[PDB]
Design an enzyme around this catalytic site. Structure first.
Site, PDB file in Angstrom:
ATOM      1  N   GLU A  73      25.142  47.728  40.643  1.00 53.89           N
ATOM      2  CA  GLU A  73      23.812  47.836  40.084  1.00 53.89           C
ATOM      3  C   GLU A  73      23.478  46.412  39.580  1.00 53.89           C
ATOM      4  OE1 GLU A  73      24.276  49.942  36.374  1.00 53.89           O
ATOM      5  OE2 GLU A  73      22.150  49.727  35.815  1.00 53.89           O
ATOM      6  N   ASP A 119      39.220  41.432  30.338  1.00 54.25           N
ATOM      7  CA  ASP A 119      38.621  40.099  30.350  1.00 54.25           C
ATOM      8  C   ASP A 119      37.159  40.179  29.931  1.00 54.25           C
ATOM      9  OD1 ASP A 119      38.538  37.310  30.624  1.00 54.25           O
ATOM     10  OD2 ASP A 119      37.841  37.441  32.725  1.00 54.25           O
TER      11      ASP A 119
HETATM   12 CL1  SC8 Z   1      29.281  34.394  37.394  1.00 54.57          CL
HETATM   13  C1  SC8 Z   1      29.253  35.979  36.797  1.00 54.57           C
HETATM   14  C2  SC8 Z   1      30.318  36.416  36.009  1.00 54.57           C
HETATM   15  C3  SC8 Z   1      30.342  37.721  35.542  1.00 54.57           C
HETATM   16  C4  SC8 Z   1      29.290  38.574  35.826  1.00 54.57           C
HETATM   17  C5  SC8 Z   1      28.212  38.140  36.610  1.00 54.57           C
HETATM   18  C6  SC8 Z   1      27.156  39.134  36.922  1.00 54.57           C
HETATM   19  C7  SC8 Z   1      25.808  38.880  36.479  1.00 54.57           C
HETATM   20  C8  SC8 Z   1      24.819  39.862  36.695  1.00 54.57           C
HETATM   21  N1  SC8 Z   1      23.510  39.751  36.291  1.00 54.57           N
HETATM   22  C9  SC8 Z   1      23.176  38.723  35.325  1.00 54.57           C
HETATM   23  C10 SC8 Z   1      22.533  37.542  35.962  1.00 54.57           C
HETATM   24  C11 SC8 Z   1      21.418  37.704  36.784  1.00 54.57           C
HETATM   25  C12 SC8 Z   1      20.847  36.561  37.374  1.00 54.57           C
HETATM   26  N2  SC8 Z   1      21.353  35.314  37.211  1.00 54.57           N
HETATM   27  C13 SC8 Z   1      22.421  35.178  36.403  1.00 54.57           C
HETATM   28  C14 SC8 Z   1      23.054  36.263  35.763  1.00 54.57           C
HETATM   29  N3  SC8 Z   1      25.204  41.020  37.326  1.00 54.57           N
HETATM   30  N4  SC8 Z   1      24.431  42.091  37.653  1.00 54.57           N
HETATM   31  C15 SC8 Z   1      25.283  43.014  38.175  1.00 54.57           C
HETATM   32  C16 SC8 Z   1      26.627  42.521  38.268  1.00 54.57           C
HETATM   33  C17 SC8 Z   1      26.592  41.216  37.693  1.00 54.57           C
HETATM   34  N5  SC8 Z   1      27.558  40.273  37.489  1.00 54.57           N
HETATM   35  C18 SC8 Z   1      28.199  36.828  37.105  1.00 54.57           C
HETATM   36 CL2  SC8 Z   1      26.934  36.271  38.052  1.00 54.57          CL
END
Ligand code: SC8
EC number: 2.7.11.22
Length: 290
Positions: A73, A119
């Protein structure tokens, strides 16, 4: 994978690149994570049923060409970015309380099924425009492990790591997630990371400097853990009034329980939900800029 249109790279996760993507079929907007040993496949498969409103939904698993993709999601923002954005005035207490309350509900649910995150950190606490917050990547640590560096060599943060992990405990428990969440709670209140360690020993010594060097009185068995050294310096415990002003007595009492050294004594998510700090909890809608 031919069923997805990558919209944009959203980050470099622990295990691989994370993209915002669109289902070429249902038009659904999702997060796609690039990560296979049969054990990993089975563990991840179980996570498809670990559904709760405060846990980012695992939609599917794609294993092709011996490559693994997880489809989740999608949420527009994370707590790390929200906190940086609210650095000037800080997140209002009612919103910190609501977020903590919701995260604890997520933990209580997963912990009741004996599944750990291991984590937790602001980067994987995701928020929407409705005032919800959700835990991302739950269960991935047991399935894939937690490496020292990510796939892009970035250091995996130690800031939210429980002391039992740092001291070499092999069979840590659900209490490790309560510790991480308590560190995040303190960070939302003070607008500064609680224990910003830059090595395992700096992480441990920063913990000891604030909470006192653990001994057999506060944590029976501690001196027998694999990485415990009798030569650790002995620091005195600081009062929480100094650590997290201007948190009120209810908040400080709950934080102090979330940061107990002995994992067996550390408050559970279920018990924390009953704490008086949540007596007047509400669900404010944060101001998001997408
Ligand atoms: Cl690198 C990293 C590490 C852990 C979780 C994530 C990460 C970040 C998001 N959304 C937040 C977001 C949306 C747009 N740009 C940046 C962040 N999401 N949405 C669903 C899974 C997820 N995992 C990410 Cl991207």
């Amino acid at each position: 994978m031919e069923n997805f249109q990558k919209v944009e790279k959203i980050g470099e996760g622990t295990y691989g690149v994370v993209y915002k993507a669109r289902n070429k079929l249902t038009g659904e907007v999702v997060a796609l994570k690039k990560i296979v040993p049969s054990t990993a496949i089975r563990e991840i498969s179980l996570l498809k049923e670990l559904n709760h409103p405060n846990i980012v939904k695992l939609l599917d698993v794609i294993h092709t060409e011996n490559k693994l993709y997880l489809v989740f999601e999608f949420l527009h923002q994370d707590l790390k970015k929200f906190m940086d954005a609210s650095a000037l005035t800080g997140i209002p207490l009612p919103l910190i309380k609501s977020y903590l309350f919701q995260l604890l509900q997520g933990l209580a649910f997963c912990h009741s099924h004996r599944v750990l995150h291991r984590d937790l950190k602001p980067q994987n606490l995701l928020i929407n425009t409705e005032g919800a917050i959700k835990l991302a990547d739950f269960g991935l640590a047991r399935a894939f492990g937690v490496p020292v560096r990510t796939y892009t060599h970035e250091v995996v943060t130690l800031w939210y790591r429980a002391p039992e992990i740092l001291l070499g405990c092999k069979y840590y428990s659900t209490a490790v997630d309560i510790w991480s969440l308590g560190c995040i709670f303190a960070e939302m209140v003070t607008r500064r990371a609680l224990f910003p360690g830059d090595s395992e020993i700096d992480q441990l010594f920063r913990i000891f400097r604030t909470l006192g060097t653990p001994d057999e009185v506060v944590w029976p068995g501690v001196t027998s853990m694999p990485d415990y050294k009798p030569s650790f310096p002995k620091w005195a415990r600081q009062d929480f009034s100094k650590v997290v002003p201007p948190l009120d007595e209810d908040g400080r009492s709950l934080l102090s329980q979330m940061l107990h050294y002995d994992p067996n004594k550390r408050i559970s998510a279920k018990a924390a939900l009953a704490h008086p700090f949540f007596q007047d909890v509400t669900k404010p809608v944060p101001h998001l800029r997408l």
